[PDB]
Amino acid sequence: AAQTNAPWGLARISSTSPGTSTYYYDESAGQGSCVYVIDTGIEASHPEFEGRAQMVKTYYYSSRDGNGHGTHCAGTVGSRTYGVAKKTQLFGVKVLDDNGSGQYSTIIAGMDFVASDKNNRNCPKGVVASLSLGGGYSSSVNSAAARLQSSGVMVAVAAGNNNADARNYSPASEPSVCTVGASDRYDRRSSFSNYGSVLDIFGPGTSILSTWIGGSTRSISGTSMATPHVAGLAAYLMTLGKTTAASACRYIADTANKGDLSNIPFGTVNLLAYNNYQA
């Protein structure tokens, strides 16, 4: 399949070179998989989701996304126009309030919710979790992510937007999960992107166009934008049967575009997510 005039991030993950605008992908499109978006919520009524998105859990007075961040990430995972896996199912878990903030205990409970709730869902191709959030180091937030990965859920987390070593940030510093950095359309490391040895992969993160609340769209930047690219790719590769939840991050690193990114600090891998699709 080919989507003309796709967002630059979608065209990048299916390209060996930057500067293209057509997203190529197998038409399975993540059908049969499920991706949890652990964020501020999802505006499920957005027509871009085509009824494939729904809120399954909230820790606040409403499950509605009154922020736009969680809707934007879910749009990058599997919206029809701005999504990597255009046929996956999206389950919203609102652990962040409408200001984008949330206590670590609530975030920890949300990860343990996904660990159990996936047994209540129909995901024969596998389950993915997309964590576009982060804060200071916390061994309990890290261990909640390891428990989530250990249960058979591909956990993709943001490296962080501190332009520092992600070792001092959770759940970014949890080694068992997939820590994702951000790059821009000229294959440069995003000026805000965290780095370090804990990073597993890079994804498009600067000026990413996706859904927004109010049935609208907008373009924002952040490692929180690169994480849904990897998560959607994992649900895409898992539906194709190319990998599993325990080995998706390793498989994505193995098939990534190598050495194409600039301003990658010494010790940080120079890998860019790549779906390896041949039309």
From Swiss-Prot:
Q: Name one GO biological process term.
A: proteolysis
User: What does the record note about the cofactor?
Assistant: Binds 2 calcium ions per subunit.
Question: What GO cellular-component annotations does this UniProt entry give?
Answer: extracellular region
The positions flagged as active site in the entry are D39, H69, S224
Residue ranges crossing the lipid bilayer per the database entry: none
- Which top-level enzyme class is recorded in the Swiss-Prot or TrEMBL entry? hydrolase
Give residue ranges for domain Peptidase S8. Answer: 7-279
Per the record, what are the reactions this protein catalyses? Hydrolysis of keratin, and of other proteins with subtilisin-like specificity. Hydrolyzes peptide amides
Q: Which residues bind Ca(2+) 1?
A: P175, V177, D200
User: Which cysteines form disulfides?
Assistant: C34-C123, C178-C249
Q: Which cofactor does it need?
A: Ca(2+)
The record's EC number reads 3.4.21.64
Residues noted as binding Ca(2+) 2 in the record, renumbered to the chain? T16, D260
Q: Name one GO molecular function term.
A: serine-type endopeptidase activity
Q: Give UniProt keywords alphabetically.
A: Calcium, Disulfide bond, Hydrolase, Metal-binding, Protease, Serine protease, Signal, Zymogen
Give the family per the record. Answer: Belongs to the peptidase S8 family.
What does the protein in this record do? Answer: Hydrolyzes keratin at aromatic and hydrophobic residues.
Q: What is this protein called?
A: Proteinase K
* Organism per entry: Parengyodontium album (Tritirachium album)
The gene for this chain is PROK
Q: Which residues of the full protein are shown?
A: 106 to 384 of 384
